[PDB]
Protein backbone atom coordinates (compact mmCIF):
# COMPACT_ATOMS: atom_id res chain seq x y z
CA UNK A 1 0.00 0.00 0.00
CA UNK A 2 1.45 3.20 -1.27
CA UNK A 3 1.29 5.49 1.72
CA UNK A 4 3.02 2.78 3.83
CA UNK A 5 5.73 2.43 1.15
CA UNK A 6 6.38 6.19 1.49
CA UNK A 7 6.57 5.93 5.25
CA UNK A 8 9.08 3.08 4.82
CA UNK A 9 11.10 5.23 2.35
CA UNK A 10 11.11 8.11 4.85
CA UNK A 11 12.14 5.87 7.75
CA UNK A 12 15.08 4.60 5.68
CA UNK A 13 16.11 8.11 4.64
CA UNK A 14 15.99 9.32 8.25
CA UNK A 15 17.99 6.22 9.32
CA UNK A 16 20.56 6.90 6.55
CA UNK A 17 21.05 10.49 7.73
CA UNK A 18 21.65 9.20 11.31
CA UNK A 19 24.15 6.53 10.17
CA UNK A 20 26.25 8.28 7.51
CA UNK A 21 27.94 11.55 8.42
CA UNK A 22 29.09 12.28 4.84
CA UNK A 23 26.05 12.07 2.58
CA UNK A 24 25.94 12.40 -1.19
CA UNK A 25 24.35 15.85 -0.82
CA UNK A 26 27.30 17.03 1.29
CA UNK A 27 29.89 15.33 -0.91
CA UNK A 28 28.54 16.89 -4.13
CA UNK A 29 28.64 20.34 -2.57
CA UNK A 30 32.31 19.81 -1.66
CA UNK A 31 33.03 18.39 -5.16
CA UNK A 32 31.42 21.31 -7.03
CA UNK A 33 32.68 24.06 -4.66
CA UNK A 34 29.48 25.13 -2.86
CA UNK A 35 30.34 25.16 0.87
CA UNK A 36 38.25 23.32 0.75
CA UNK A 37 39.74 19.77 0.59
CA UNK A 38 43.52 19.32 0.43
CA UNK A 39 44.39 17.97 -3.04
CA UNK A 40 46.71 14.93 -3.37
CA UNK A 41 47.87 14.70 -7.00
CA UNK A 42 51.46 13.42 -6.76
CA UNK A 43 54.04 12.11 -4.31
CA UNK A 44 55.01 15.60 -3.05
CA UNK A 45 51.40 16.51 -2.20
CA UNK A 46 50.73 13.13 -0.63
CA UNK A 47 53.61 13.94 1.75
CA UNK A 48 52.23 17.44 2.43
CA UNK A 49 48.73 15.98 2.87
CA UNK A 50 49.79 13.24 5.33
CA UNK A 51 55.96 2.74 1.02
CA UNK A 52 53.34 4.87 -0.72
CA UNK A 53 51.16 2.24 -2.45
CA UNK A 54 50.93 0.25 0.82
CA UNK A 55 50.13 3.35 2.91
CA UNK A 56 47.31 4.13 0.50
CA UNK A 57 46.02 0.51 0.58
CA UNK A 58 46.07 0.62 4.42
CA UNK A 59 44.18 3.96 4.36
CA UNK A 60 41.46 2.38 2.19
CA UNK A 61 41.25 -0.51 4.66
CA UNK A 62 40.76 1.76 7.68
CA UNK A 63 38.06 3.69 5.79
CA UNK A 64 36.29 0.35 5.02
CA UNK A 65 36.47 -0.63 8.70
CA UNK A 66 34.66 2.60 9.61
CA UNK A 67 32.19 2.14 6.77
CA UNK A 68 31.35 -1.44 7.86
CA UNK A 69 30.34 -0.10 11.28
CA UNK A 70 28.19 2.71 9.75
CA UNK A 71 26.56 0.25 7.32
CA UNK A 72 25.84 -2.22 10.11
CA UNK A 73 24.08 0.48 12.13
CA UNK A 74 22.02 1.37 9.06
CA UNK A 75 21.15 -2.31 8.40
CA UNK A 76 19.85 -2.61 11.98
CA UNK A 77 17.33 0.18 11.20
CA UNK A 78 15.82 -1.71 8.23
CA UNK A 79 12.48 -3.03 9.59
CA UNK A 80 12.71 -6.74 10.19
CA UNK A 81 16.53 -7.05 10.02
CA UNK A 82 17.32 -7.30 13.76
CA UNK A 83 14.65 -10.03 14.13
CA UNK A 84 16.40 -12.27 11.62
CA UNK A 85 18.51 -15.13 12.92
CA UNK A 86 21.88 -13.66 13.94
CA UNK A 87 23.66 -16.09 11.58
CA UNK A 88 21.63 -14.63 8.71
CA UNK A 89 22.33 -11.01 9.81
CA UNK A 90 26.05 -11.81 9.71
CA UNK A 91 25.82 -13.57 6.30
CA UNK A 92 23.88 -10.62 4.79
CA UNK A 93 26.49 -8.15 6.02
CA UNK A 94 29.45 -10.35 5.09
CA UNK A 95 28.33 -10.65 1.46
CA UNK A 96 26.69 -7.20 1.20
CA UNK A 97 28.99 -4.71 2.85
CA UNK A 98 31.49 -4.30 0.01
CA UNK A 99 28.68 -3.81 -2.52
CA UNK A 100 27.47 -0.96 -0.27
CA UNK A 101 30.96 0.43 0.28
CA UNK A 102 31.46 0.75 -3.48
CA UNK A 103 27.98 2.23 -3.98
CA UNK A 104 28.67 4.91 -1.36
CA UNK A 105 32.23 5.46 -2.65
CA UNK A 106 30.66 6.58 -5.93
CA UNK A 107 28.92 9.43 -4.01
CA UNK A 108 32.39 10.80 -3.15
CA UNK A 109 33.80 10.40 -6.70
CA UNK A 110 33.93 12.38 -9.88
CA UNK A 111 35.71 11.47 -13.10
CA UNK A 112 38.87 13.11 -11.73
CA UNK A 113 39.21 11.81 -8.20
CA UNK A 114 37.75 10.87 -4.82
CA UNK A 115 37.05 12.57 -1.49
CA UNK A 116 38.98 11.19 1.49
CA UNK A 117 38.94 11.78 5.25
CA UNK A 118 35.29 12.81 5.40
CA UNK A 119 35.85 15.42 2.66
CA UNK A 120 39.01 17.00 4.04
CA UNK A 121 41.11 15.58 1.19
CA UNK A 122 40.70 14.82 -2.52
CA UNK A 123 42.91 12.21 -4.19
CA UNK A 124 43.20 12.35 -7.98
CA UNK A 125 42.33 9.40 -10.18
CA UNK A 126 45.52 9.95 -12.18
CA UNK A 127 47.58 9.77 -8.96
CA UNK A 128 45.97 6.47 -7.99
CA UNK A 129 46.57 5.10 -11.53
CA UNK A 130 50.28 6.01 -11.16
CA UNK A 131 50.91 3.59 -8.27
CA UNK A 132 53.21 0.63 -8.95
CA UNK A 133 51.62 -2.61 -10.20
CA UNK A 134 49.33 -4.09 -9.09
CA UNK A 135 48.15 -1.13 -7.00
CA UNK A 136 47.78 1.15 -10.07
CA UNK A 137 44.66 -0.82 -11.05
CA UNK A 138 43.01 -1.07 -7.60
CA UNK A 139 40.71 1.95 -7.93
CA UNK A 140 40.19 2.18 -11.70
CA UNK A 141 37.22 -0.30 -11.83
CA UNK A 142 35.57 1.62 -8.99
CA UNK A 143 35.90 4.96 -10.82
CA UNK A 144 34.56 3.28 -14.01
CA UNK A 145 31.53 2.06 -12.04
CA UNK A 146 31.05 5.44 -10.36
CA UNK A 147 30.98 7.48 -13.56
CA UNK A 148 28.19 5.30 -14.96
CA UNK A 149 26.35 5.10 -11.65
CA UNK A 150 26.53 8.84 -10.94
CA UNK A 151 25.01 9.48 -14.41
CA UNK A 152 21.74 8.09 -12.98
CA UNK A 153 21.62 11.18 -10.68
CA UNK A 154 20.33 9.35 -7.61
CA UNK A 155 19.88 11.29 -4.37
CA UNK A 156 20.34 10.19 -0.76
CA UNK A 157 16.64 9.25 -0.43
CA UNK A 158 16.98 6.93 -3.45
CA UNK A 159 20.27 5.48 -2.22
CA UNK A 160 18.84 4.65 1.21
CA UNK A 161 16.32 2.26 -0.36
CA UNK A 162 18.76 0.87 -2.97
CA UNK A 163 21.26 -0.02 -0.21
CA UNK A 164 18.52 -1.71 1.88
CA UNK A 165 17.48 -3.85 -1.12
CA UNK A 166 21.09 -5.00 -1.60
CA UNK A 167 21.55 -5.92 2.07
CA UNK A 168 18.30 -7.97 2.11
CA UNK A 169 19.47 -10.36 -0.70
CA UNK A 170 18.04 -13.85 -0.21
CA UNK A 171 20.57 -15.55 -2.52
CA UNK A 172 23.64 -15.12 -0.29
CA UNK A 173 25.47 -18.40 0.38
CA UNK A 174 24.63 -20.13 3.64
CA UNK A 175 21.44 -18.27 4.63
CA UNK A 176 19.36 -20.40 6.98
CA UNK A 177 15.94 -18.77 6.52
CA UNK A 178 15.49 -17.26 3.04
CA UNK A 179 11.74 -16.64 3.09
CA UNK A 180 11.64 -13.79 5.72
CA UNK A 181 14.56 -12.11 3.88
CA UNK A 182 12.79 -12.31 0.52
CA UNK A 183 9.57 -11.01 2.11
CA UNK A 184 11.40 -7.96 3.52
CA UNK A 185 13.22 -7.48 0.20
CA UNK A 186 10.02 -7.65 -1.86
CA UNK A 187 8.52 -4.81 0.20
CA UNK A 188 11.80 -2.83 -0.15
CA UNK A 189 11.69 -3.40 -3.94
CA UNK A 190 8.12 -2.05 -4.10
CA UNK A 191 9.26 0.94 -2.05
CA UNK A 192 12.22 1.51 -4.41
CA UNK A 193 10.02 1.33 -7.52
CA UNK A 194 7.59 3.90 -6.06
CA UNK A 195 10.46 6.16 -4.92
CA UNK A 196 11.97 6.28 -8.42
CA UNK A 197 8.54 6.85 -10.10
CA UNK A 198 7.88 9.81 -7.77
CA UNK A 199 11.38 11.34 -7.50
CA UNK A 200 12.47 10.68 -11.15
CA UNK A 201 9.22 10.62 -13.19
CA UNK A 202 11.12 11.78 -16.28
CA UNK A 203 13.71 8.91 -16.02
CA UNK A 204 12.34 5.97 -17.86
CA UNK A 205 13.28 2.49 -16.74
CA UNK A 206 15.38 3.83 -13.86
CA UNK A 207 14.24 0.93 -11.66
CA UNK A 208 15.44 -1.68 -14.17
CA UNK A 209 18.73 0.17 -14.53
CA UNK A 210 19.25 0.04 -10.75
CA UNK A 211 18.49 -3.68 -10.56
CA UNK A 212 21.27 -4.17 -13.12
CA UNK A 213 23.68 -2.06 -11.02
CA UNK A 214 23.13 -4.61 -8.20
CA UNK A 215 24.51 -7.33 -10.50
CA UNK A 216 27.37 -5.08 -11.58
CA UNK A 217 28.38 -4.44 -7.96
CA UNK A 218 28.76 -8.19 -7.42
CA UNK A 219 31.20 -8.30 -10.34
CA UNK A 220 33.17 -5.41 -8.83
CA UNK A 221 33.57 -7.26 -5.53
CA UNK A 222 34.47 -10.57 -7.29
CA UNK A 223 37.18 -8.71 -9.30
CA UNK A 224 38.48 -7.02 -6.16
CA UNK A 225 38.87 -10.37 -4.35
CA UNK A 226 40.82 -11.55 -7.47
CA UNK A 227 43.14 -8.55 -7.16
CA UNK A 228 43.63 -9.25 -3.43
CA UNK A 229 44.72 -12.82 -4.19
CA UNK A 230 47.32 -11.38 -6.62
CA UNK A 231 48.48 -8.84 -3.99
CA UNK A 232 48.75 -11.45 -1.20
CA UNK A 233 50.98 -13.79 -3.26
CA UNK A 234 53.23 -11.06 -4.73
CA UNK A 235 53.70 -9.09 -1.47
CA UNK A 236 54.67 -10.09 2.09
CA UNK A 237 51.39 -6.68 5.27
CA UNK A 238 48.03 -8.26 6.17
CA UNK A 239 44.44 -7.10 6.46
CA UNK A 240 42.79 -5.37 9.37
CA UNK A 241 41.11 -8.04 11.57
CA UNK A 242 37.57 -7.01 10.68
CA UNK A 243 38.41 -7.28 6.96
CA UNK A 244 40.10 -10.64 7.53
CA UNK A 245 36.87 -11.91 9.03
CA UNK A 246 34.71 -10.54 6.18
CA UNK A 247 36.95 -11.81 3.37
CA UNK A 248 37.53 -15.31 4.86
CA UNK A 249 35.45 -17.67 2.64
CA UNK A 250 33.98 -14.68 0.84
CA UNK A 251 33.41 -16.23 -2.52
Amino acid sequence: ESADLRALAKHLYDSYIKSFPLTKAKARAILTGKTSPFVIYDMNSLMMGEEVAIRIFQGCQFRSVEAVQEITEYAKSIPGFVNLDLNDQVTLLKYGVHEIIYTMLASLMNKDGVLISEGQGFMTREFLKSLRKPFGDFMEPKFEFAVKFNALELDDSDLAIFIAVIILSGDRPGLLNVKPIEDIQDNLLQALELQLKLNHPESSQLFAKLLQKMTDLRQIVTEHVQLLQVIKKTETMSLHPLLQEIYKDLY
Binding site: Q69, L86, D88, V90, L93, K94, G174, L242, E245, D249
Partner: peptide, 14 residues
Amino acid sequence: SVXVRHXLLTAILX
Protein backbone atom coordinates in the same frame (compact mmCIF):
# COMPACT_ATOMS: atom_id res chain seq x y z
CA SER B 1 28.20 -22.04 12.22
CA VAL B 2 28.44 -18.59 10.73
CA UNK B 3 28.23 -16.93 14.21
CA VAL B 4 31.36 -18.72 15.42
CA ARG B 5 33.43 -17.60 12.43
CA HIS B 6 32.44 -13.92 12.81
CA UNK B 7 33.20 -12.76 16.36
CA LEU B 8 33.63 -9.12 15.40
CA LEU B 9 30.62 -8.76 13.12
CA THR B 10 28.54 -10.41 15.85
CA ALA B 11 29.78 -7.90 18.42
CA ILE B 12 28.89 -4.96 16.17
CA LEU B 13 25.41 -6.44 15.42
CA UNK B 14 24.66 -7.14 19.12
